Design a binder for these strands. Structure first.
Ligand SMILES: [K+]
Ligand SMILES: [Mg+2]
Ligand SMILES: [Mg+2]
Ligand SMILES: [Mg+2]
Ligand SMILES: [Mg+2]
Ligand SMILES: [Mg+2]
Ligand SMILES: [Mg+2]
Lengths: 136, 49, 223, 132
RNA sequence: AUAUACCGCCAUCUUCAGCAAACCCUAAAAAGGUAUUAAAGUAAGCAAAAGAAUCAAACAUAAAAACGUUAGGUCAAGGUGUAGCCA
């Protein structure tokens, strides 16, 4: 005898209730553990519903300030001819070096975006990076 | 005394002329007559093996 | 005598982290294993939005700060269950990780069911396994979906039998019936490999801790 | 359909014995003969008389041990000796069986003019081959 | 007298492939319950199959063939319910 009603309450609440009624005479071994270290949320059934009208989710689009610079670099030079290595946790791509230098110049106090874009290209050219201004 | 000697002795002491040999008297080792593995698949605690 | 049995079973519940599961993992360790990568925004379940840090260009990102809190609770619960000699069943239907999960269960000393799940396995267990079959005391769902992108039957059936479930839930999953949800990536081999390692070390520690606790208390009885 | 000596299927709750379970075509294959005499062998006489004695001996044993027979009796004739082998339930007291054996033996030995012996194997209850 | 009260023993579809019961599941069920790179069905029966018979072996032939259908046949094989006869 049990409560195979998984849409009312939770495994813990149904086990608590069954013992109060007098049907379950021995506590499950997982019961005392749940009482002492419960989950953050109670595991109760809820019917997923759809959103209607003007209800919307609340998920923040992840856009950092570097993305403004990165977008320009991809539009002007595309992706660096060197291939991304996403297995190296500290990989520095050609675009990420462009954004690191672009930031340094902006710290000096340059206020014109055009100035920061052409100066960074010159600095990387001195470094020896091959930047191709591919309109294609 | 062997399994062959057993089967021969049982045939002499309990002569049966039934055509189907599954229906004749048999004194075989329990491993044969019973299914090989009908044993419990868990112990006293109830934890499967 | 009675005090010793009470000491073995009642003392562990007086400490917040009796098995010190906190050290096994860290937010950085989870980030290396790509545990923060979720499905596209279209595949998102409504009950997962609490756990999602945001949407990075169409790909939902899973907050690894909530994952650490939830994973801590799930690992602690899995340890106390293993400490008390409960049966733990690993369940998944992802065929890429079928052999890995069966190897993990065998290493832990527990059970795995990575194959087609028969209707009634838990709600009609006596007919299938025998009159006195003992059902699992905890089910760990490394994957909570079957191969037709529907909830694994054992999620609902484990709630019907009042079995607690520790499940890995991704952005497209429904965590409502999972007792201890662990928000995280379930598709990447590096994410699944990390979770399998954590569950196996945690279970082995709790089993070892029980052996040591029994010897100390047992030795005191003559001594 | 054939209706001869076939204990037909019920709903899984009817306890049939080994003898009842098997239809006539299993005679000499899975189940033997309840009576063994030499009167149906080739070039042998008195089949009619041996068969009539068997019919009576079965009706006599049923009435003499009413409700105490677990299965059909087995009749074995050797020379002029007749031997009746019956499975009997343990319902009656032990001393009553000694009375019915002494009575049924003497009565059938003076009726057919042969030495007749009764062999009784007592069972705790009817043996069930299968539930049909 | 009644096979239109039955037992017993059969015909017919028929060497056709089905009949019946215990459990489990459903945002209720009037019903349904399959997916094998598997999605709720499971585990036992009866028939088929297998086995046995035609005295090597096969094939073939016999035998076997459930639940139902035809108030099918048989009160005259025997037994028997109900009604009827007893100078
Ligand atoms: K009839
Ligand atoms: Mg996934
Ligand atoms: Mg008729
Ligand atoms: Mg007529
Ligand atoms: Mg043959
Ligand atoms: Mg056949
Ligand atoms: Mg008619």
């Amino acid at each position: 005898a049990g409560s195979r009603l998984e849409t009312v309450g939770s495994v813990f609440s149904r086990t608590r209730d069954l013992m109060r009624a007098g049907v379950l005479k021995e506590k499950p071994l997982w019961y005392d553990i749940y009482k002492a270290f419960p989950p953050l949320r109670e595991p109760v059934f809820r019917r997923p519903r759809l959103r209607y009208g003007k209800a919307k989710a609340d998920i923040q689009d992840i856009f950092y300030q570097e993305d403004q610079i990165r977008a320009k670099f991809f539009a002007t030079y595309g992706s660096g001819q060197k291939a991304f290595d996403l297995f190296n946790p500290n990989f520095k791509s050609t675009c990420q070096r462009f954004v690191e230098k672009y930031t340094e110049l902006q710290n000096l106090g340059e206020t014109d975006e055009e100035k920061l874009f052409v100066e960074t290209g010159k600095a990387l050219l001195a470094e020896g990076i091959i930047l191709r201004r591919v309109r294609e | 005394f062997a399994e062959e000697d057993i089967d021969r002795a049982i045939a002499y002491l309990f002569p049966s002329g039934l055509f189907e040999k599954r229906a004749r008297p048999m004194m075989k080792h329990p491993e044969h007559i019973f299914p090989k593995q009908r044993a419990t698949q868990w112990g006293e605690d109830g934890r499967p093996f | 005598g009675d005090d010793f049995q009470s000491r073995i079973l009642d003392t562990p519940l007086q400490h917040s982290d009796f098995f010190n599961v906190k050290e096994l993992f860290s937010v950085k360790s989870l980030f290396e294993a790509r545990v923060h990568l979720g499905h596209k925004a279209g595949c998102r379940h409504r009950f997962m939005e609490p756990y999602i840090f945001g949407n990075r260009l169409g790909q939902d990102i899973i907050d690894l700060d909530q994952t650490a809190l939830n994973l801590q609770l799930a690992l602690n619960f899995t340890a106390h269950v293993a400490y008390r000699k409960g049966i733990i069943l690993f369940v998944s239907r992802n065929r890429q990780f079928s052999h890995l999960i069966e190897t993990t269960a065998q290493a832990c000393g527990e059970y795995a069911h990575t194959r087609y799940f028969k209707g009634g396995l838990l709600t009609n267990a006596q007919l299938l396994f025998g009159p006195s079959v003992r059902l699992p005391d905890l089910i760990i769902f490394l994957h909570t979906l079957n191969n037709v992108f529907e909830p694994h039957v054992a999620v609902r059936d484990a709630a019907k039998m009042n079995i607690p479930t520790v499940g890995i839930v991704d952005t497209n999953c429904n965590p409502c019936l999972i007792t201890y949800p662990i928000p995280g990536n379930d598709d990447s081999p590096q994410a699944i490999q990390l979770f399998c390692k954590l569950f196996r070390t945690t279970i082995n520690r709790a089993k070892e801790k029980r052996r040591q606790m029994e010897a100390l208390h047992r030795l005191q009885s003559p001594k | 359909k054939n209706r001869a000596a076939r204990v037909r299927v019920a709903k899984g709750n009817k306890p049939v014995s080994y003898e009842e379970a098997h239809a006539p075509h299993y005679i000499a294959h899975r189940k033997g003969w309840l009576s063994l005499h030499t009167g149906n062998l080739d070039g042998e006489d008195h089949a009619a008389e041996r068969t009539l004695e068997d019919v009576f001996l079965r009706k006599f044993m049923m009435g003499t041990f009413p409700g105490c027979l677990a299965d059909q009796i087995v009749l074995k004739r050797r020379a002029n000796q007749v031997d009746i082998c019956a499975l009997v339930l343990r319902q009656l007291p032990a001393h009553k069986f000694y009375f019915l054996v002494g009575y049924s033996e003497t009565l059938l030995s003076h009726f057919y003019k042969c030495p007749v012996r009764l062999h009784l194997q007592t069972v705790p209850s009817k043996v069930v081959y299968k539930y049909i």
